[PDB]
Symmetry: D4
Subunit: 168 residues, 8 copies
Amino acid sequence: IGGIAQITSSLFLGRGSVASNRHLLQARGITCIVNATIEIPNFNWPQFEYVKVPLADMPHAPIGLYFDTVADKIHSVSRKHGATLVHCAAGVSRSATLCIAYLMKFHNVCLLEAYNWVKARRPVIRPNVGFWRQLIDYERQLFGKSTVKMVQTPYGIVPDVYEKESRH
Amino acid sequence: IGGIAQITSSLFLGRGSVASNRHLLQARGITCIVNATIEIPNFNWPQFEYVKVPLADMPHAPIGLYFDTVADKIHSVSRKHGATLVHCAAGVSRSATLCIAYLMKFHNVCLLEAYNWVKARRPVIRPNVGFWRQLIDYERQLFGKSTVKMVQTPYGIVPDVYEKESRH
Amino acid sequence: IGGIAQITSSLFLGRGSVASNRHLLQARGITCIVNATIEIPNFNWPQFEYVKVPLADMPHAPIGLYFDTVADKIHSVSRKHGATLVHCAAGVSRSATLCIAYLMKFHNVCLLEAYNWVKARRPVIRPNVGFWRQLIDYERQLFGKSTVKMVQTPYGIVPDVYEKESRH
Amino acid sequence: IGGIAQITSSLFLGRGSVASNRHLLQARGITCIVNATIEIPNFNWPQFEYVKVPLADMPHAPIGLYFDTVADKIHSVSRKHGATLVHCAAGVSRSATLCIAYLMKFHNVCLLEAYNWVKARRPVIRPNVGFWRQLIDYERQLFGKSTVKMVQTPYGIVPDVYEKESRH
Amino acid sequence: GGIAQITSSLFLGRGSVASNRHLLQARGITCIVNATIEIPNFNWPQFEYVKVPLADMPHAPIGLYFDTVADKIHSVSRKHGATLVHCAAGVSRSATLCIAYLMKFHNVCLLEAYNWVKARRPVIRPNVGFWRQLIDYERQLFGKSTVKMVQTPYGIVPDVYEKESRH
Amino acid sequence: GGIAQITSSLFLGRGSVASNRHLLQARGITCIVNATIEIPNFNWPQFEYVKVPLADMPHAPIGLYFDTVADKIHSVSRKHGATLVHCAAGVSRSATLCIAYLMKFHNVCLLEAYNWVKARRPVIRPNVGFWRQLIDYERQLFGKSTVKMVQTPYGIVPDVYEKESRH
Amino acid sequence: GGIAQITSSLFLGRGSVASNRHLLQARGITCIVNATIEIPNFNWPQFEYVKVPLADMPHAPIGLYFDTVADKIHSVSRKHGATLVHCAAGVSRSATLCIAYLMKFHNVCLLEAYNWVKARRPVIRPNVGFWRQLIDYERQLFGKSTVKMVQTPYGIVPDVYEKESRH
Amino acid sequence: GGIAQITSSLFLGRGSVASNRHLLQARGITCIVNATIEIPNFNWPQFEYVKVPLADMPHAPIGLYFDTVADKIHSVSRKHGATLVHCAAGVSRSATLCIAYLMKFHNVCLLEAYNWVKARRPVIRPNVGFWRQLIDYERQLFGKSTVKMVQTPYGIVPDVYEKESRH
């Protein structure tokens, strides 16, 4: 289905549009919805637990303050044998960033691998550059070293992966 | 009901969506609607008095310029035995900020208590960081001291309450 | 009608919503529509001439580059015995700014008077602070002196009129 | 039709609204859709190939990182005897910028000519000032010299073409 | 010159006068506040030195010394001594600390305190960041401000600088 | 060197020449404008001193002194004296005030006033913020500008600096 | 003064003491780290010189020298020599490098390392950018921070400066 | 020291060596490029002086002098003379102009030109803004860059500074 992708057995990433499709989420065994937007209200179906993370998709939004709490929630739900959908509006930046943070913390994968993991399943992902700065700091906190660097290009400072992609 | 919360006997906070539900507001004895958005037009039901506060939810929006005027209006309406709904779009930042300012001015509660008060009723509230700077200044004007400080984290400068929340 | 206000015999200001109401505009003798938004497409009724001014409502949007061209168009239409609607999204910032510039250029009124003129008819107007900087420069170009100053408040730098309003 | 313009035999520029009109695009022989927005989901008709370029219309969005890849795709499609629609939301900034970059790279035209080319067909185009900085750099990379300069006006720094337009 | 008396127990000066023990002893100075990072205390035994190691820059957080320096000048005054607050030019860093002192211990508003120091030492010109910090300190002490930052074509400045430019 | 004549009653210089009374008296100088925070007035009795305590920085609001300094140079000229406007390097602060004077009292546009001072003292190079302020002052005086700020790969500069880089 | 001992093999100082070979030889100094762009190494044969050509500015990337300078002080110590780290004022640049050294080689947290150097040389006052860089280096070494940057009315500063302002 | 030879006709130095005519004449120097605002040309008759009145600051538009200074060094070389490019510290301003010269007239990329000057004068350290400008100039000359600006915990720097911090 358009607008949703499976990342792990207990974690899905999506656009806000899929978040109100009760049947689609039940079909995936989704029990918990993390709404990583300020601007989309929770639909509030009784079937799901809802967690609101009220951030804008902006480089200075302090999304990192939710890295541990959302990652811990995804883990808690999984250990209780449920599954989580982390959604934003576009399924591009806010939700992807939180999924990448979760993969690093609970799947022992570096930031480059965590990006490639999510990107393999949802190729449209594109965390904003501030979110990248925050992910890089979090990676350094977890592993004591970084696998993505911010680099200056003629078009702005971006993670090196974006520069590499621009050259095919 | 989703999208509205009672803060005091004469003050409610909400999303813009509830603002056009005449029956819902009448059921709460609401007589005055403060529309704290630029982008949502007043529905203009004859039953309510309307006050437009045309701000964007942005850290440099000078929301503080409305602290006294909106707080005074809420107080005026209450003393005339009515009730006010302060709404924005998401019910997260603009409206919450104005309600917090009102609680400090007319309920003699410090900024930390005023935040906790609104947060107990509407847990999704999350004033943006600029709004926090402005609330902290207003608190200092009212009480000559502050109960929330802006602190630098790896994810940006935020009020200390957000940093504390990030550690559970 | 909600969302439209008459400023002069040949100039109206509005929200984008009124711009597609053919009957409402015909009732006012409107012959020309200035769409001061990037994000709203022209409805394109055959009855009106359309002018697109594709700006965002942001303090660094260079709205001043349209001061002379839009003001000249309003004047041209008026001298051809028609009338212009200048609309944006909210009828608060972009359209009001262009109307204020027109009043200064073709009605020989200073910036404070031009603001008060539009504000008397549409009290919700609130040009953003960058638009204010640009209006102040344009006023200085026209009259060699200014009647509004940008002042620093605890809540940001704003035109003095906003600070004055905050104290009732 | 409103919201779409032909730039070359194999390249069209549009608003997102036209992008879901299967019949309109088939009528133009469009085989590939480049969706240059984060916020509009691909409609996904089977008849078209879709390419998502998930950028916001903001001066610091690093749109330049897509100059070669989108321009190469337009060229690839054309050489395979198809045609591409590059769309954004408003058909003003993101899509126009990518079309201008393509014209420089594959039609051997300088930046001023490439702008005038697109502007002749879709007069509402108005790339944001950051996009202009990026186009100017790309022009310099391609030709070793520039035909548009950023200039400071009372209303902000803008490409010289915008200043020239403001004086009629 | 390079030295001006501000109160009976407070002098403001340039760095040049700070090491001149005869000049300082003739005014009953017992305490030297060196509001510079770049000038070393001479450390004559007869004076106590307090170093305030700040640059003359708008973001130097000089307001963090308003209470500590004001309190020291006051303490020294009460002990029947006198303080010299000096910087390099006697224009900005030292002037700002003296202004803060006058507000805290002489119960005058910011406008009056600035006018007082300016009358005593006409070259004084706190930098615009120091003015922002003085304005906030005034609001803390009195609950209102008597100088506002205003935008001119040449930058945001305290309104007193705008007024001075037209006279 | 370190001193250049700009008009019959106006000289521009480096700080080094400011204290040389023989040099100044030989040119009939009666007024010294010290456009520095960091150099103290020497205060010879025979000259009147005006201090303009600004740093050579783009955000220093030097434009607040355009009228006051221009008016003083004019007043001194009308009294048959002459003024020296000096800074430290004789490059930026003093050059900017002289340019402003020429526009106000010699009825020349900014381009002409810059070319005039540059011809007299080829090292002059107002900082880019001072240029922004000069441009605004020109627009105030004449209602149009003759120098524009332009973006180059090396920063935003007055177009005269861009032109100079290609010749 | 202008020189303070930090450990048995590490001294911190002002530029003034750097060229005084008798003073340095009396402390067994064999290595001079000149943490300034603006002071030239004197180059007496008997000392090895390392230049760290940074300004005392918040965006100077002094953290790029934390490991290299810390490692050199350690190497010199292990060879039974001693190092002088000097800047101009002995306040910010040199203090910051010494603090970084103490964290890396003396296994103390940032708060303790700052308190240590401050106890030895009370005038020390790293600039706020250097503090940001020290905080990040602390987090790299220990996985937690013991000093936080906090907003005050006078600017964002390390919490230790806020605490000092109230005592 | 304070002087280093870069090519047969180009020397780089500190301000201190600029006035030493014997030192300069011994190297066949006929042209002095003074890349400072703050040091006055000594103006010995035997040398031609070119002043480049820039501060050592990241936003100083030094790139506007890349072609003019490179061309002058080349012209002087072709006339069988030699040029000294000096600043104050011989670290940043003069180093940057020399690097630009090597790219334009010695057909080496930015990495090679930096390595060349650094080998000759190990203290060199262009400021980060000068690096941005050098990178753009390299791209203009060659159509590709060999040094990239990269974010470290201590700021955005040329990758060569990041590499140096780990060795």
